[PDB]
């Protein structure tokens, strides 16, 4: 699921799945 | 940033993990 174009909710989902209990930051700006 | 790397271009695990805490 990671090796594709990932935008919006799709990108946030990928971050969520990859980062797990660490969490993540989503900074589109 | 992440949009340029993963939305406009093709993402990778290596790049996604740069945004984990």
Per-domain residue ranges of chain A: 1-29
Which residues lie closer than 8 Å to A20 by C-beta, 6 or more apart?
none
Distance, CA of A22 to CA of A5 (rounded, Å) = 23
- Tokens standing for B7? 């939305």
- Distance, in angstroms, between B18 CA and closest chain A CA? 9
Cα dihedral value A6, B21, B18, A1, nearest 10: -30
Torsion sign across C-alpha atoms A26, A19, B15, A3: negative
What are the chain A neighbours of B18 within 8 Å (beta carbons)?
none
* Method used to obtain the model: X-ray
Q: Which of B1, B14, B20 to mutate against chain A (most A CBs within 10 Å)?
A: B20
A19/B10 Cβ within 8 A: no
Q: What angle do CA B17, A4, A2 make, to 5 degrees?
A: 35
Distance, CA of B4 to CA of A23 (rounded, Å) = 21
């Amino acid at each position: 699921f990671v090796n594709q174009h990932l935008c919006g909710s799709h990108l946030v989902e990928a971050l969520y799945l990859v980062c797990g209990e660490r969490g993540f930051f989503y900074t589109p700006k | 940033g992440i949009v340029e790397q993963c939305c406009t271009s093709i993402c990778s695990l290596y790049q996604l993990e740069n945004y984990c805490n």
